[PDB]
Structure formats: C-alpha cells, structure tokens
Amino acid sequence: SVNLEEACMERCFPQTQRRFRYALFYIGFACLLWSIYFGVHMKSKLIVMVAPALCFLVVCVGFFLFTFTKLYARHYVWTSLVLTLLVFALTLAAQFQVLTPCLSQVGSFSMCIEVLFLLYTVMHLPLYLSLILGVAYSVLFETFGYHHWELLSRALLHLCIHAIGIHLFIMSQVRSRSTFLKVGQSIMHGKDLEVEKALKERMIHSVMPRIIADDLMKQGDEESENSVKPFKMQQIEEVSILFADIVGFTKMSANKSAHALVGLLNDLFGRFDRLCEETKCEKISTLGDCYYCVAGCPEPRADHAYCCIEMGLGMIRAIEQFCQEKKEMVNMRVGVHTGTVLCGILGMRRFKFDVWSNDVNLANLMEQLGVAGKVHISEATAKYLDDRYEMEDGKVTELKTYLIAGQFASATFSSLLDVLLSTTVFLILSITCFLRYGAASTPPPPAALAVFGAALLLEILSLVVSVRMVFFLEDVMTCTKRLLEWIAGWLPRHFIGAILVSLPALAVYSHVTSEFETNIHSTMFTGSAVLTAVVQYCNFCQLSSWMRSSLATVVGAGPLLLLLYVSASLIGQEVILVFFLLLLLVWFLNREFEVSYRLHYHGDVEADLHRTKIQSMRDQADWLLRNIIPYHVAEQLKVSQTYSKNHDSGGVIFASIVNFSEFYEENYEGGKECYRVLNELIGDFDELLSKPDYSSIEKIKTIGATYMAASGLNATQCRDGSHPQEHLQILFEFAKEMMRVVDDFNNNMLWFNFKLRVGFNHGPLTAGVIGTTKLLYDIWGDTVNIASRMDTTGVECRIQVSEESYRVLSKMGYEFDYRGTVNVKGKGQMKTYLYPKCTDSG
Amino acid sequence: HHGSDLGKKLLEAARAGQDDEVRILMANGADVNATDDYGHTPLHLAAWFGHLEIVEVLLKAGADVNAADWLGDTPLHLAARIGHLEIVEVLLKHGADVNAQDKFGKTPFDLAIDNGNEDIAEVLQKAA
C-alpha cells in the first residue's frame, strides 16, 4: 500500500508543523532560563556559559523562520534530524566540564530528560534511528559523567525512561493512522449512497406513474414507504383510452430465432412511448402483441381526445414507415373509447398502476370489432370531437361508431497496554529505591515493604481484571465477572486512575521518611528518582487531562515543597527550577494527546453511522429489482444489454373471477371498498406464493381483474435423479390451492359468492424484457393466446384444460370429464375437458 | 386475550347455533365482544345464521349495539340487509341509531329498499 502509506503522511502535515513550532519555542525558553540562572544569581566568575545560550537562541529563531520554505515539504524530516544533532552536541558539552571535587546531577538529569522527550515525541522520525540515538545518548551521558551502584541506578533510570518513550511513540503512530483510515471510509460511502438513491428513484418511476411517484417520494404516505421497504386509488371522468393489437402477430413468429422479435418490439415501443412523452399522453402497459395507452388519467385534460386520435394516427404512420423500412407487411388494429374509469394499484407483489371499468372491456371489444388500418371512434368520442377531420361512419356488417382512416485501535486494549506499562515501570522504580542500600541489607522502615506489598497486590489485581476482560477468559464464571465489571463509568475510571497515577510518588517517599539530610548523595538521589517518577504520570490517556495534570504536579512536587524546610538551599532553588520546567513539559504533552483521542472518537462514530445508512438503501433497491424481473435475467443483464430466451415446453394457467361483473354497485362514492376487499384477496393470493416450495412458479402479472402464472422455466438446472416434468403437476396443485383459498374466502365473505373461470395449457413459449430506462418482463408464443381464449371459453369453478394437457395429465392420476367441442381462432377446432366431477346436482 | 381461542371458539359456536357450547364458554370467562380478524361479531354471525336465541343470549351477555366490520356496518344495517323483522326489532329496542350510516355511506333505509324488504322500511320510517 505504498500509495496508501504515502498519501497517509501527505495528509498529516500541518499537525507535524505545529508540533515542531511548539518544540522550538520550548527549547528556546528553557535555554533562556538557564542563561538567566548562570548569569544574574550564581556563576559570576565566567562568561563562558552565556554565549552558547545566545547562539542557541539565534539558531532557534533561524529555524522558526526557516520552516516556511518550499524546500521543506519533503525535507522537514532531516531538518528535525539536524536540529536534534545540535541538541545532542550542546547537551553533552554542557555535561563535559564537571566533577570538580560544577553542577549537580539533578540539572544534568533534567536536561537529559527533556532532550529525550523532544526527541521521541515531536521530531517525527523513524523508529529504529530514534531508539539507537536514544541508547547512544544514554550511554554517552552516563559514561561522560565519570569525569558503582549510583551509576547503575542512573542507568536503570535511563531504561525506564526509554520504555515510557517508546510506548508513547507507538500509541501516537497508531492513533494517527486509524483516524485517517476511518475518515477515508466515511468519504467513500457517500457517493455510493447517492448512486443507490438515483437507481431506486428511477425504478420507482418506471414501475408506476409520474404523478403518484412525485407525490410520494416526499414520503407523504409513511405506509407507502414501509411497503416499498399504503396508497390510494381514485375515480375519474371523461378520459380517453386507446388500444392497439398486431394483426397476424403469429405469422411473424413462425420459425424465427426469438431474438429479432425482442429488439424490433423494443424499437417499436420505444418509438411509440417516445411519441407519447413528446405528445403529452401517458402509457399504461402492454399485453404481448397489444400496446395500449390512456390520456388524462392522473390529471384530466380538456382536449385529451385529440391527443388520443393523434396517437392513433401516429401509430399508423410509424407502422407504415417500418413496413416500408424493413419490408414486413403488417397492420395494426386500433380501438378508442372515452368514458369514466377508476384507477389504482392492486396487490403488493408485481403491483402495477392500472385502471378499471366496463368501458375498458368495451374499448377492447370495439377494437376487436374494428378494421385494421383505421381507428374506430365512438359516439362518446364524437360528442366533442369538433369534426375537424374526415367524418366517415363504419359499422359492423355481421353503437353509433365511426371509422377514421386518418387525417488495534480498540479502547479497552490500550487499558491493557498502559496498565502493563505502569506496573512494570513502577515495580522497577521500587526495585532501584530498594537497591539504594548497599551496606545495610534490611530497611529500617517497614513502611517501604508495606507500601511495596500494597502496590504489588493492587497492580496484579488490576492486571488480572484487565486480562480477564480483554481475553474473555471467564475462567471461573461469567456473571461474577459481569458484576465485577459494569461499575466503571465516568467516576470509577476517574478515581481508580487517580490512585494508579498518584501511587509512584508515595513509592518514592517510602524511603525519605527515614533520614536523608546528613549525607549529600542521598538527597541528589531522591531528586533524580522523584523526577523519574513524576515524568511517568502521563501515560493513562483514556482518562481526562486536567485531573492527571493537577494530580501529577501536586503529588509529585508539593511534597518536595514540604521537605524543603527540613534543612542545602541552593540545590533547592535549582531543583525547583528543574521541576518547574518538567511540569511545563507534561502539561502540553498530555493536552496534545487527549485532543487526538477526542478527535479519533469524533470520527469513528460517524464512520459507522454512514456505514449503517448505506445498508438499508442497498437492500431496498435490491428488493425493488427483485419485484420486477426474475433473478436469473437480473444477473444475466449484469453483463449484457437485453434479455431474450425460448422454452420448447412450459405450463401456464389463467384465472379470473366471473361473478364480479354484477358486483359493481356504484351507489357508494367511488365504489372503492369492493376493490379494497379484492386487494386483500389478491394479497392473500401472493402470500400463498411465499411458501419455500414455490420456486417453480412465476406469476407473470395482474391483468385488470385476472391472474396469469406459468411454470417450468425458472428450472434451468437439470438432474438425472429427477423427473423434469413435475413442474406441470405441481402447478396443477397450485391451481388446486388457489381453488381452496377462494372457496375459504367465499365462506369468510359476507353474502356474496365469488366464482372464477380457470384454464390450463402448456407449450413452447418465449420470454424477453422490453423497457429500457423502464422495465417490463413478458412472455409470448403460440399457446399463450390459445390458453387465454380457451379460458374465455370456460365454466365457473371448472378447470378447463387443453386437449394435449389433458392427455399428459390423464395418466398422472387426475380424472376429468369431456365437456364439449370448442372452435378457436388460429388453430381451429379443439376439444375441452373439465376437472371438477359431480359438483352440481345433476 | 392471550392465545384467544376463546374468541374464535365462541364465534364458531355462535354461528353454529350450539347453545350449550356458548353457555359453557360463558362459564369459562368468554369475551362477550370477541370478534374475528375481519371485525365481524357474534351478534352479526347470529344475524347471518338466524339463531335468534343466540342474539338474546349475547345481548344479555353484555354485547354492544353498533358493532362494525371492515365494511363498518352496524348490526341494524346487517339485519335490514337480511330481511328478518324480529331480529331488527330486538336490536332496535336496544336503541341503535338510524340517522347514522356505515362507510358505505347509506342509511339502513337504503339497504332495506334495495334488498326489497318493506317491513324494515316502515319500521325505520316511524323512528326519530
């Protein structure tokens, strides 16, 4: 991830700049204080030690102005390198000329500690060079102080300091990486979410009209939004409805590849609906070879009949132009009607906006009764036609109608890390303070051993609690641990942290309660160890800032303010100076780390917020995709443009309520309740499909008040341990369960009987997808219209079956009775059989 | 109530006409106004199956007067739809409103008219 890990430090510049500038200010200020110390108060015998202070002041101001340059954006690393080399040399030089019996070890060790920290935190250099420079500095200082137990103690101090530093460095690195990664994820997600929104909106407008979609995408109906995870229907007056059917549609589908048909129909209907949007009339849907539209449905218009007749003429023009274009002699039956219609949406599966009345059937019939190439207008169309065209009356030769031919980063893990750190460094500091004794093996104070025991016990219990919580040990039981964990909120963390951060100061004061005022090495040792302890009080970054700062300062320095009176004073003034500087460091450093923790938290929350917002949108869009098309053609179009297929044999059933025709009482305003009841009925019908065994059945769509389904095509997978014909039988019991459900609802319906005509067939068919930027899956073939016509020549509560389907089912166990002989268009005479037996009295 | 097989069982006994079962269920703390999923009522079921004695049992069991289905019809409307005068009388003596209408938007006079029953029409036309 070289590009990644390069852009990472590409984005991290101004923070590094700010840290550098603070470091420079601090080092200059400390050097100025030591110049003042060496000048006014004491060391009046020489000017040797103030000139280096002045020159370091000027080099600091030089770097201060230097950072602005353009030869810095890829060179600041080595700039910090040269500055740290300068500091190295100056510090060792300030050490070199000592051990006269001229400066005590307290100031030397101080200036060592600040050099080491400004190295580890701010300079922002790689790890291995940093650590080798640290160990080199440590050894050089400790061996240049010689110009053995005390020295060994100082070395151990160096090791503890290095531990603190390397830990803090790693923590800063990890916290730096993680926030950039999280903000990167949050940046990535928004664009994809905006894309998903557009896809959802497009598909919604595809499946259902413009007006209701624009009214509802402001979630005017919360039920609609919860359903599309409900809506309303209306009744309207004086609307124009147009139908058109292909003449000789079976002829063009004799022995083709079933592919050119899909594309040519795509182009045809693209032209037609193109002209639709360019003529301000609204399409509804299609049935195979039939294309039909309405005018002024969502919003009535005053001159919708003119739009309808102009659509008829334009369709005539387009079909004649295509006939001249590709040379296929076809004509296009047209029917047109005007009247009143109630419009709405039925069902929750494959639901499509539609319209209903007797006038729609009347228009379809009057299309079937008209002549090809000329539109068959009605007297209802002629009430307000303004007769601006050719007036010609064309009637059936075998109602006042006319014919018109045109015109890591886990918060609880860091607790493990820093508790581990505190316990190990504290234990080693106690080791050295115990190691102070060389002549007397036992400590006269017992309080040192008591405090040692208390500390070791407290640290080990905290350690085992942390390791149980993180590793999920559950070594004894879970519920004991659970009531041993939940207590820690805002206050328990404050208080346990306060104790765990304070306690090293008490550890160092373990030994000072005894005598240290006689010998001179003891007091200097206590100063060294106490600064070593007080610097450690910064790690626990999970806590707050002001608490740890005030605690560290007070419980680390104030006791020395107390022990100052127990009288060596000049060493006192220098040591208060060094502790002033030390607290000055720790305040800024701990602030700098708390702010970074805060910002990391402020980022990760919104990362997961947007991540959860995307998922619901994705599932919603996928469900809408599944609403329209089968999954198979969905994944097929993911690498394609269109879909087209054929099946040499498939079963199909058609079914529609027959006694619904008298149930159109319109005394109620709109008659909406009956269609509501129909809606729950069809919703139950869809809920029937939800069974897991119903993967072999494809409900094609709802057609007005009818219901069409097929089978045996979704089964693309064939096994030799299977019979590939069971789809027909299972679909036959699917019809049976439909029969049972309608009977049960008729039982549960209050005083009205519902009966249906149902017809079954099977044969070779073809499948395709039509709309582009719109969507519609559909089926064509030779047996679909035959099945529809035979179902039309059916009997209520009777499963009428095609003769060949009768032959293939008679041996399957089901028994029927021959009904009669029915003559059908396209194929001629055909026999009919009935599934119900002895249903009536006779 | 919870797992209310009592409601469905009392409804099925109500339109079944099995009196002893209804009495036993009543001894079993049967919910008097327990209904189906669709909102039909035991009084309406009794009107459907014409078990008048069940109508009296339910009305003395603590039944309501303006029970409405998903179609919202009050039992007065249902009985005017049937054509049974006695059921209409024993329900209107409870004081069912005649100036109101269900969500179909029609008074019981209209439903008495279209169902061809005159008796209900003169019964209601005398009311205030």
Author numbering:
A (entry chain A): 97 to 197, 217 to 262, 278 to 359, 384 to 552, 566 to 574, 780 to 939, 976 to 1250
B (entry chain C): 9 to 136
Quote the study's own text.
Adenylyl cyclase 9 (AC9) is a membrane-bound enzyme that converts ATP into cAMP. The enzyme is weakly activated by forskolin, fully activated by the G protein Gαs subunit and is autoinhibited by the AC9 C-terminus. Each membrane AC contains two conserved cytosolic catalytic domains and twelve predicted transmembrane (TM) helices, with cytosolic N- and C-termini of varied lengths and regulatory roles. Here, we present the cryo-EM structures of AC9 in several distinct states: (i) AC9 bound to a nucleotide inhibitor MANT-GTP, (ii) bound to an artificial activator (DARPin C4) and MANT-GTP, (iii) bound to DARPin C4 and a nucleotide analogue ATPαS, (iv) bound to Gαs and MANT-GTP.
To better understand the observed extended density protruding from the nucleotide-binding site, we determined the structure of AC9 in a complex with DARPin C4 and an ATP analog ATPαS (AC9–C4–A) at 4.3 Å resolution. While ATPαS is also an AC inhibitor, it lacks the MANT-group and is likely a better representative of the nucleotide pose in the ATP-bound state of AC9. The structure of AC9–C4–A is very similar to AC9–C4–M, with the full model and soluble domain RMSD of ~2 Å and ~1 Å, respectively. The absence of the stretched density observed in all of the forskolin-free MANT-GTP-bound structures indicates that the stretched density in AC9–C4–M and AC91250–Gαs–M map corresponds to the MANT-group. A similar conformational change is also observed in the AC9–C4–A structure, indicating that the overall domain rearrangement is primarily driven by the DARPin C4 rather than by the ligand occupying the active site of the cyclase. The similarity of the MANT-GTP and ATPαS-bound state of AC9–C4 complex indicates that comparisons of distinct MANT-GTP-bound states provide a valid interpretation of the conformational transitions stabilized by different AC9 activators in the presence of MANT-GTP as a nucleotide substitute, at least at the resolution of our 3D reconstructions. The DARPin C4 binds to the C2a domain of AC9 at a site that partially overlaps with the Gαs-binding site. A partially active state can be formed upon DARPin C4 binding.
